[PDB]
Short mmCIF file of C-alpha atoms and ligand atoms in Angstrom, two decimals:
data_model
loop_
_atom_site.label_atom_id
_atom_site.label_comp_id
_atom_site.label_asym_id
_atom_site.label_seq_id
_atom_site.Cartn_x
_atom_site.Cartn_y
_atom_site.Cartn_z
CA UNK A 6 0.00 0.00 0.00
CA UNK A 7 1.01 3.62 0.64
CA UNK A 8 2.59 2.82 4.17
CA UNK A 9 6.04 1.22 2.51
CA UNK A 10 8.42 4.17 4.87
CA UNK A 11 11.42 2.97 6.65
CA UNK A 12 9.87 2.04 10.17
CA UNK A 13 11.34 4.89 12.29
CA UNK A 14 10.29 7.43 10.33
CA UNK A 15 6.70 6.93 10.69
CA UNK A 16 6.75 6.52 14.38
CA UNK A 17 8.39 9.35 15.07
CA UNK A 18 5.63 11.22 12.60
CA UNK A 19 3.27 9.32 14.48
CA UNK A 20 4.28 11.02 17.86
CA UNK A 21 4.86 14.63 16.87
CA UNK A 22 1.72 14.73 15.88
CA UNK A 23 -0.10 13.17 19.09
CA UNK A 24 1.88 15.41 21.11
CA UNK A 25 0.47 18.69 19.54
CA UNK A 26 -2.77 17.59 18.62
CA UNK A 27 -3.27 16.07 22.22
CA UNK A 28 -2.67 19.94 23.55
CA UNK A 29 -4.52 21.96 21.50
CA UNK A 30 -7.85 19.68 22.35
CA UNK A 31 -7.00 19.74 26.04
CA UNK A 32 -7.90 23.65 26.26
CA UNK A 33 -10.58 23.74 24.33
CA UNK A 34 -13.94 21.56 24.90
CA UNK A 35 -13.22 18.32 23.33
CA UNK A 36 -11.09 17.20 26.00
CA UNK A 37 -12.88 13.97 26.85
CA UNK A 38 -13.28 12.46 24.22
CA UNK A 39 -10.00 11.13 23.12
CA UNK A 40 -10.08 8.39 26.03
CA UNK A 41 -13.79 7.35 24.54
CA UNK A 42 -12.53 6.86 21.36
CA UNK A 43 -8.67 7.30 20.98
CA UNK A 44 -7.44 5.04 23.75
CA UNK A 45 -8.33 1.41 22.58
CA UNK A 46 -6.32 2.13 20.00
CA UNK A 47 -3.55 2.14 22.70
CA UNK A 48 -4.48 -0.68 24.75
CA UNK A 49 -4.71 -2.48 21.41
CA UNK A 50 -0.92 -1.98 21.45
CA UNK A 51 -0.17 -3.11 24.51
CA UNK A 52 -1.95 -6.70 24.67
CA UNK A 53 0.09 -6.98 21.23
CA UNK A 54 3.29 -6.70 23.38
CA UNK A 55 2.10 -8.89 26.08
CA UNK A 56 1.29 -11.85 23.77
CA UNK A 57 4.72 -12.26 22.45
CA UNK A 58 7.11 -11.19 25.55
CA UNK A 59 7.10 -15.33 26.34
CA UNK A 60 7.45 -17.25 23.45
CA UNK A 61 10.42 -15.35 22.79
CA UNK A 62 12.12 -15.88 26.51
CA UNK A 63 11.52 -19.53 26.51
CA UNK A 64 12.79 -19.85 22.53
CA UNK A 65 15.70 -18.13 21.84
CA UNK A 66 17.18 -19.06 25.11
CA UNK A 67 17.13 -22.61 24.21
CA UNK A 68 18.61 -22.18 20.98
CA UNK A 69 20.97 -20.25 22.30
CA UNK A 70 22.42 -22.42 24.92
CA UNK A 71 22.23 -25.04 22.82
CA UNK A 72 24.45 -23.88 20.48
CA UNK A 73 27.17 -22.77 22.67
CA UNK A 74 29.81 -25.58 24.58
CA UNK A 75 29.24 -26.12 27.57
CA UNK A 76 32.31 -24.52 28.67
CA UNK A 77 32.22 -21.46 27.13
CA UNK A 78 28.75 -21.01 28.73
CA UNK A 79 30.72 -20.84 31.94
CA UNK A 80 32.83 -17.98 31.30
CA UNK A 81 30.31 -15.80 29.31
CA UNK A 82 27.65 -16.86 31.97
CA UNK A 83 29.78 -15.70 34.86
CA UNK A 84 31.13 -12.52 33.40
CA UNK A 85 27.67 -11.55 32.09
CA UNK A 86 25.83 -12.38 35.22
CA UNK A 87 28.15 -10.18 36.90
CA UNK A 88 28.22 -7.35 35.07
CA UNK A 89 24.22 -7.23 34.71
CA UNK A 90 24.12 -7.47 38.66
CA UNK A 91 26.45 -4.99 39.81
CA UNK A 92 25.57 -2.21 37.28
CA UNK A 93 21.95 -2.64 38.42
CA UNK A 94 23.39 -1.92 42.19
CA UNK A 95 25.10 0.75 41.49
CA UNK A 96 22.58 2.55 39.52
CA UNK A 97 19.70 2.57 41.92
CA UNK A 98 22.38 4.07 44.62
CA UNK A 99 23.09 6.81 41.90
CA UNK A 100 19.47 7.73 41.94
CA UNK A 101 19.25 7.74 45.76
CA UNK A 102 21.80 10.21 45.79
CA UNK A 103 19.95 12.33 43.06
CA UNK A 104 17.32 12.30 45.78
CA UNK A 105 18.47 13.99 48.25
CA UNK A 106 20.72 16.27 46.20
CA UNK A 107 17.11 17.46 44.45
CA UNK A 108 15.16 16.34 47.54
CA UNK A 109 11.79 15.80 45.88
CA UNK A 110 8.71 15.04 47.59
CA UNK A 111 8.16 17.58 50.26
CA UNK A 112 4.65 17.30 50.83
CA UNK A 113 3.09 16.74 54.07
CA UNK A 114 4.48 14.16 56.98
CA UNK A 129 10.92 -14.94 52.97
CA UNK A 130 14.62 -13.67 51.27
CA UNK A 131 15.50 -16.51 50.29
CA UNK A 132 12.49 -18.42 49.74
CA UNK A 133 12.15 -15.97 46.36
CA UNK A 134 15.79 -17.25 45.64
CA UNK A 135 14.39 -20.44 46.22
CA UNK A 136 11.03 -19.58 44.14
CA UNK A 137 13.05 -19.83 40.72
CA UNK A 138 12.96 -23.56 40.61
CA UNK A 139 9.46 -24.06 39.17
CA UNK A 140 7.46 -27.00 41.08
CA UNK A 141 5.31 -27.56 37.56
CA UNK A 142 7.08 -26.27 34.45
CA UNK A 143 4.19 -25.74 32.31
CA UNK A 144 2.26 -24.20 35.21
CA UNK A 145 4.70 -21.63 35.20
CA UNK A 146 4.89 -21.19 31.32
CA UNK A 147 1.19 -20.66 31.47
CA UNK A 148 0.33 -18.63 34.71
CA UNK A 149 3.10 -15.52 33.48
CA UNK A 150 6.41 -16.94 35.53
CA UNK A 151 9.33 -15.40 33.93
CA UNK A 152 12.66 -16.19 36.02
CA UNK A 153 11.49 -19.85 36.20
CA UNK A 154 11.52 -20.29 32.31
CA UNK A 155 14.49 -18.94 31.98
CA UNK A 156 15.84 -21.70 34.15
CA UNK A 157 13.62 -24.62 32.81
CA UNK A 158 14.77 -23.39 29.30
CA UNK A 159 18.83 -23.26 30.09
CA UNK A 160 17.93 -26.48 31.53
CA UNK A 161 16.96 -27.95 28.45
CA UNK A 162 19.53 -26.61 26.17
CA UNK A 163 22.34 -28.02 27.83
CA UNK A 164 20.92 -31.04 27.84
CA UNK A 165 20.00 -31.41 24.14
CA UNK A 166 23.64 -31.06 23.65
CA UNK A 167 24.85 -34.00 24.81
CA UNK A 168 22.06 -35.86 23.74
CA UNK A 169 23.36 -35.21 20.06
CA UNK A 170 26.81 -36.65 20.66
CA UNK A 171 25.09 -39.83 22.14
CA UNK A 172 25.92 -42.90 20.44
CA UNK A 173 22.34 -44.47 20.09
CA UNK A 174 21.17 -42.85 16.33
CA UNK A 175 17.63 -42.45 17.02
CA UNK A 176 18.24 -39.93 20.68
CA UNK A 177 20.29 -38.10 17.89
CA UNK A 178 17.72 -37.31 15.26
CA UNK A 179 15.09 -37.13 17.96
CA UNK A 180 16.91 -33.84 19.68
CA UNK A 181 17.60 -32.25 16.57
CA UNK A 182 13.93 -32.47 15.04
CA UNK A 183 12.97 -31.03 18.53
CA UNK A 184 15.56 -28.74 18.38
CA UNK A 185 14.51 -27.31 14.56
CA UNK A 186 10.82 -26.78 16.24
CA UNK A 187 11.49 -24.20 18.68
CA UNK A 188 13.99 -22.42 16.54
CA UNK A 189 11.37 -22.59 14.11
CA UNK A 190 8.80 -21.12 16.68
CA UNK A 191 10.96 -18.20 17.58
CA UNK A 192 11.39 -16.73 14.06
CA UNK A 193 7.76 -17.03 13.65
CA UNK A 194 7.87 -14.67 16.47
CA UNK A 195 10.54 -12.24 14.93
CA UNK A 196 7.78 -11.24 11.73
CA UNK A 197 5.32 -10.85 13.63
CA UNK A 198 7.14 -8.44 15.82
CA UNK A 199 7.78 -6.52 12.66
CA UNK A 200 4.34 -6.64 11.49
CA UNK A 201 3.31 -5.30 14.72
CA UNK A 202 5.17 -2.28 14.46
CA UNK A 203 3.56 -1.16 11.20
CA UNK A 204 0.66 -1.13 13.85
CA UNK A 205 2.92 1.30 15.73
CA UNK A 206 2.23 4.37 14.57
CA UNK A 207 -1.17 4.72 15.41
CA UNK A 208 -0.57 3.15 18.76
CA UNK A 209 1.83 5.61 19.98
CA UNK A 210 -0.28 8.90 18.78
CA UNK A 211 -3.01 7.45 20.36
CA UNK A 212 -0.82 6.90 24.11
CA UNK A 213 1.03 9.79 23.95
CA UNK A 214 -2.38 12.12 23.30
CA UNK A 215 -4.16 10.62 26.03
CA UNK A 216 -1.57 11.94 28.44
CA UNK A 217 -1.50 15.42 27.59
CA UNK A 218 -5.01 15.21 28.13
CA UNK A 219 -4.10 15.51 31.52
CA UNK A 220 -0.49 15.68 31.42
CA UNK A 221 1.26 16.03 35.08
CA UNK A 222 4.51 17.57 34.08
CA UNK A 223 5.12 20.96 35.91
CA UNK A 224 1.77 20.83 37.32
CA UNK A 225 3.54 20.94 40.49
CA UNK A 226 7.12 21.54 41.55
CA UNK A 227 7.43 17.91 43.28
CA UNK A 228 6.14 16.20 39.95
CA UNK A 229 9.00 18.05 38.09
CA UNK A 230 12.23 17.52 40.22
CA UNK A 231 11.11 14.23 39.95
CA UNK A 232 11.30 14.20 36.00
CA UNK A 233 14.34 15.69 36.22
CA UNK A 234 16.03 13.70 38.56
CA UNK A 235 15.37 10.62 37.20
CA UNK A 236 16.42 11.96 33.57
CA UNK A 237 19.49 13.19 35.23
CA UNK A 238 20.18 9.97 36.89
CA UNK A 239 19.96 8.16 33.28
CA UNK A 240 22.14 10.87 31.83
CA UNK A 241 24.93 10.65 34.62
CA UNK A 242 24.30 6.66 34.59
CA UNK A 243 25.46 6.44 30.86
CA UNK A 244 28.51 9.13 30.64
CA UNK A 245 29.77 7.76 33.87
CA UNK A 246 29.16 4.13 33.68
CA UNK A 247 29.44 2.89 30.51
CA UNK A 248 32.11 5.16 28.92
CA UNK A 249 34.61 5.03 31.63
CA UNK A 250 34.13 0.63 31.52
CA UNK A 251 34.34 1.21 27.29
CA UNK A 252 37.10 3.49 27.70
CA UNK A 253 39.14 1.29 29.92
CA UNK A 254 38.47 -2.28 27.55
CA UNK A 255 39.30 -0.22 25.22
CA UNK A 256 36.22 1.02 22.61
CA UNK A 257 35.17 4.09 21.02
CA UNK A 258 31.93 5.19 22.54
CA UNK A 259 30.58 7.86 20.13
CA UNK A 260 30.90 4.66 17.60
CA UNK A 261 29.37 2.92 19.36
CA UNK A 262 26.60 4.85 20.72
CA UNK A 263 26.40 5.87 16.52
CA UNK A 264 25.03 2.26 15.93
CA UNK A 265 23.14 2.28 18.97
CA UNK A 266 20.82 5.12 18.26
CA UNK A 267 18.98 3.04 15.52
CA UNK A 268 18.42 0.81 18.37
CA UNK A 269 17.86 3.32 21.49
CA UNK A 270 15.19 5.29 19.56
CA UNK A 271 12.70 2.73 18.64
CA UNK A 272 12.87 2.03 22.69
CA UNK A 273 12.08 5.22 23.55
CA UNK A 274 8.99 5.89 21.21
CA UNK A 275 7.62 2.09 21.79
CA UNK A 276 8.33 1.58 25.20
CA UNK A 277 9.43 -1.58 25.13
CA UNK A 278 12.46 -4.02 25.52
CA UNK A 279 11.44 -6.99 23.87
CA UNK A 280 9.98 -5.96 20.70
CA UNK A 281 13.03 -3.89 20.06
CA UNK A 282 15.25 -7.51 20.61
CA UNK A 283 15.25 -8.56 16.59
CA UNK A 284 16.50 -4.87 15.96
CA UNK A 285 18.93 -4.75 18.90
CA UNK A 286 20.65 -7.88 17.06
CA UNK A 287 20.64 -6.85 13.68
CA UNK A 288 22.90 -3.90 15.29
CA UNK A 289 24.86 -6.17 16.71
CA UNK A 290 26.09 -8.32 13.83
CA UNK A 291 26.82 -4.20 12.06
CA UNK A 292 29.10 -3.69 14.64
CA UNK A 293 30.84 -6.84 14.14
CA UNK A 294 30.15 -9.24 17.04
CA UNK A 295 30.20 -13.10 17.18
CA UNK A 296 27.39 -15.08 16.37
CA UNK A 297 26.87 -17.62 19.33
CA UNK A 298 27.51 -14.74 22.52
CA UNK A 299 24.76 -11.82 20.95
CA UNK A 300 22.44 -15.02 20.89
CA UNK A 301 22.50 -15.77 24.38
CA UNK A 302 23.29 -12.41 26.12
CA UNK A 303 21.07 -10.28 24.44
CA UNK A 304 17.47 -12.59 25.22
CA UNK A 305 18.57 -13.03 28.71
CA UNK A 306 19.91 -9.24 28.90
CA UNK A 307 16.02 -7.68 27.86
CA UNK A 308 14.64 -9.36 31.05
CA UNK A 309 17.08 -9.64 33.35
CA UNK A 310 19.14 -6.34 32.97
CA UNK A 311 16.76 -3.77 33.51
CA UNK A 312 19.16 -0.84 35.07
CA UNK A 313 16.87 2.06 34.70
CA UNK A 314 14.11 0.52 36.16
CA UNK A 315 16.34 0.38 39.37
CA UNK A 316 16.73 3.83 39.30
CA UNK A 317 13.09 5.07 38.59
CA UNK A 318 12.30 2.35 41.67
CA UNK A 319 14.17 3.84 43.95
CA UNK A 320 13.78 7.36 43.51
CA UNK A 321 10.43 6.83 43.55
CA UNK A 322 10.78 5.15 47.01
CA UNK A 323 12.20 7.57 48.58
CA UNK A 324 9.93 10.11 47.42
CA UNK A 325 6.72 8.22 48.85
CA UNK A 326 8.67 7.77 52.14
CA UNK A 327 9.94 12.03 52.61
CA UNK A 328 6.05 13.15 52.05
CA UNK A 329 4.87 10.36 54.41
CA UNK A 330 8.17 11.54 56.52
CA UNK A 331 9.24 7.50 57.03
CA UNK A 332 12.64 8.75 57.70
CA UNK A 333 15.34 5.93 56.13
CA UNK A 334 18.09 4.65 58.41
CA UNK A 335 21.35 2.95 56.57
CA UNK A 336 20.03 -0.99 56.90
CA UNK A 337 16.72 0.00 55.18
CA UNK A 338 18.64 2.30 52.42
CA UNK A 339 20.53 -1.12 51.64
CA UNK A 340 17.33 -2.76 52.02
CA UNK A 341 15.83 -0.77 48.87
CA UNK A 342 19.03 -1.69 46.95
CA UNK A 343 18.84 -5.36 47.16
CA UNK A 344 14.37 -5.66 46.70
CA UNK A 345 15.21 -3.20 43.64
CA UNK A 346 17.56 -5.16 41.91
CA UNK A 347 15.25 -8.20 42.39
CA UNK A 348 12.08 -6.22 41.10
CA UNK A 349 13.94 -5.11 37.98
CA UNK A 350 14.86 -8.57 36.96
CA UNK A 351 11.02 -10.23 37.52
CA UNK A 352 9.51 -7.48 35.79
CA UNK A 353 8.64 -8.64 32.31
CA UNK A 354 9.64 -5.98 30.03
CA UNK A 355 6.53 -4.04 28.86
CA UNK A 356 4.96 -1.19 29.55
CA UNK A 357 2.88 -1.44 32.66
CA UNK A 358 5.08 -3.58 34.54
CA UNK A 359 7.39 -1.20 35.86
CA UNK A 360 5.02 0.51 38.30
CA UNK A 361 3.25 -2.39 39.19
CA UNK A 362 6.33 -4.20 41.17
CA UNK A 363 7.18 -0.27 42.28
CA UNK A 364 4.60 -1.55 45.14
CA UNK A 365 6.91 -4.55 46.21
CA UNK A 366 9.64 -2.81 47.07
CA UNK A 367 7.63 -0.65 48.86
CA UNK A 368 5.47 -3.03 50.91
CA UNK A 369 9.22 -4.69 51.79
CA UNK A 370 9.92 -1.43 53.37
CA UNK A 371 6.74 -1.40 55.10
CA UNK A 372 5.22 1.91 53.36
CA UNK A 373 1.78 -0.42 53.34
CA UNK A 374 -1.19 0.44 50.41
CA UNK A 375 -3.33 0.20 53.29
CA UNK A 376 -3.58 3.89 53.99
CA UNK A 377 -5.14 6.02 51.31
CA UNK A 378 -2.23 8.53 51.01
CA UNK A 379 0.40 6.49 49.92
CA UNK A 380 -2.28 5.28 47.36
CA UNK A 381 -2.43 9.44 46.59
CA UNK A 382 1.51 9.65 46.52
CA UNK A 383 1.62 6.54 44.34
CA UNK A 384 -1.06 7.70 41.80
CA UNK A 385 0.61 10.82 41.24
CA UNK A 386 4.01 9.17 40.01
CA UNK A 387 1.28 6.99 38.05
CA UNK A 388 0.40 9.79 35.95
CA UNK A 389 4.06 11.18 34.74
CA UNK A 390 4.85 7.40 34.71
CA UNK A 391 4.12 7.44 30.98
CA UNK A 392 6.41 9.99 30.49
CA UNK A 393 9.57 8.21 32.69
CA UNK A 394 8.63 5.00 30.67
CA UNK A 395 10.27 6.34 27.35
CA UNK A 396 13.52 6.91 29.15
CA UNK A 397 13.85 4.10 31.16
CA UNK A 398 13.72 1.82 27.93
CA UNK A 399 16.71 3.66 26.21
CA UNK A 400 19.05 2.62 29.12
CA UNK A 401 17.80 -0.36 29.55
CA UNK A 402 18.61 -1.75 25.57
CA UNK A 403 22.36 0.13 25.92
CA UNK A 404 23.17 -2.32 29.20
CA UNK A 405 22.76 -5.22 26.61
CA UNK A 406 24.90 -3.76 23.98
CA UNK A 407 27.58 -2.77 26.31
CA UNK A 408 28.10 -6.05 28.31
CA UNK A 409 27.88 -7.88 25.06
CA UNK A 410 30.74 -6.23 23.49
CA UNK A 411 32.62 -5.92 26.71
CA UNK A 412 32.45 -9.61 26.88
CA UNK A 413 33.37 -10.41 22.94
CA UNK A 414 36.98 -8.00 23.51
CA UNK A 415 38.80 -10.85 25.89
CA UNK A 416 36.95 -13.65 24.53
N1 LIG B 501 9.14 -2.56 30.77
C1 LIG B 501 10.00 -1.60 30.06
C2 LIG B 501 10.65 -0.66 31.06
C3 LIG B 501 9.64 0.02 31.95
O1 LIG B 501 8.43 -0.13 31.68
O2 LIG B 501 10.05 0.69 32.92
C4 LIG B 501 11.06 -2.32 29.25
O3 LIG B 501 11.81 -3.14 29.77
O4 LIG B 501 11.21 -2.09 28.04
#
């Protein structure tokens, strides 16, 4: 048809013009209407997302470890691990310092049975009911073992694995198109999200509301130049190259607001700026759920502004206390739009900041709102972790 644009291009069209139109419609009368009519076409989007964030996980990882030794997994599984661990640590203690250097929200004054949890009792009960760490184990599981199935001796184990093997393989790529068709989808979907906000946008309706935009998007800002370039500089890469790839990748995050759907691209990019086949496989499916850095930050900057306006003063062992539930929250969240906020209440519940009383419900729904906002940054760091531990990892290998 008509619609035959390079992708980017019409998405970023698509949310120009939702952003203007959107505020010229919230002065005048029909102001109301858009969420009658408009917003389906948004939730239409999301469920899209949704569908296809599992399939993925369980697929890719299998062919992945699959194809990889056994030994090699080791040393890229250990050095990636690490790096996706620490870097989520250190971020969320760069935003608690952003806290009180901006000081935002004023207003008015079991730990190891979840490390235990990520051995699924029923595999398929997990698969089904929306489990994510679990399938990533059941699925790493299963790929090492298909391996040395297909060096057995007995000849029919060895075609058996391998006709298994070319099913799921054959099930992920399936998954791939329809990501891209998706997008084509896009367009509309974002003008439609982005309108409904300004609706009743949030951003400097109040002075809280806007440190806090700005000291998150500080945080990701200082989180990049300091982090990743000093760790590139010292390996020994050139960041502005490689940031010049990455903002094919880092923009479709931002608009789309999502991790997964962005994977296919994110590895096209890689195989552009010349990485091996077999490690981009692996780290890159089990970096989009797992390494999640700005989500650490938004979590607990967020924290600590519900706790100054309900005056819950932090001592040191519950400031260390925020670090380690954040890092955990970041890695079970799935890795599409909603979910971000939703464990936001975990963290805070293991603080003891309970939903029970309606004005932490009141604090919470106001980071709600500008939560649509926060969610197109967040994304862009989050893809970059994935790029820069991958190519970290192929310089000594
Ligand atoms: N779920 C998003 C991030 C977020 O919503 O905060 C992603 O991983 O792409």
């Amino acid at each position: 048809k008509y619609i035959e644009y390079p992708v980017l291009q019409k998405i970023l069209i698509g949310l120009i013009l939702g952003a203007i139109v959107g505020l010229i419609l919230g002065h005048y009368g029909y102001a109301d209407a858009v969420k009658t009519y408009v917003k389906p076409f948004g939730d239409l989007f999301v469920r899209l997302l949704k569908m296809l964030v599992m399939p993925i996980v369980f697929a890719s990882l299998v062919v992945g470890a699959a194809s990889i030794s056994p030994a090699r997994l080791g040393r890229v599984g250990v050095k990636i691990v690490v790096y996706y661990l620490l870097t989520s640590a250190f971020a969320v203690t760069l935003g608690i310092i952003m806290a009180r250097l901006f000081n935002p929200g004023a207003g008015i004054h079991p730990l190891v049975k979840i490390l235990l949890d990520i051995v699924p009792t029923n595999p398929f009960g997990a698969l089904a009911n929306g489990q994510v760490c679990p399938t990533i184990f059941f699925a790493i599981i299963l790929g090492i073992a298909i391996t040395y199935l297909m060096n057995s001796e007995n000849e029919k184990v060895r075609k058996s694995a391998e006709t298994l093997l070319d099913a799921i393989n054959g099930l992920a790529e399936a998954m791939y198109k329809i990501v891209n068709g998706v997008m084509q989808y896009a367009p509309i979907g974002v003008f439609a999200l982005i309108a409904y906000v300004m609706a009743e946008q949030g951003v400097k309706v109040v002075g809280e509301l806007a440190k806090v935009t700005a000291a998150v998007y500080v945080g990701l800002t200082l989180q990049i130049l300091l982090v990743y370039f000093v760790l590139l500089k010292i390996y020994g890469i050139d960041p502005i190259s490689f940031i010049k790839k990455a903002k094919d990748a880092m923009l479709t995050a931002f608009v789309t607001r999502s991790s997964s759907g962005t994977l296919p691209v994110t590895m096209r990019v890689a195989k552009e700026m010349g990485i091996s086949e077999g490690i981009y496989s692996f780290t890159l499916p089990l970096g989009a759920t797992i390494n999640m850095d700005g989500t650490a930050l938004y979590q607990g900057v967020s924290t600590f502004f519900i706790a100054n306006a309900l005056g819950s003063h932090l001592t040191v062992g519950q400031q260390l206390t925020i670090v380690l539930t954040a890092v955990l929250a970041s890695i079970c969240t799935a890795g599409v739009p909603g979910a971000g906020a939703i464990m936001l209440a975990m963290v805070l519940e293991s603080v003891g900041l309970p939903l029970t009383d309606p004005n932490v419900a009141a604090a919470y729904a106001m980071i709600l709102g500008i939560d649509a906002i926060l969610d197109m940054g967040r994304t862009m760091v989050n893809v970059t972790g994935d790029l820069t531990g991958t190519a970290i990892v192929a310089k000594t290998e």
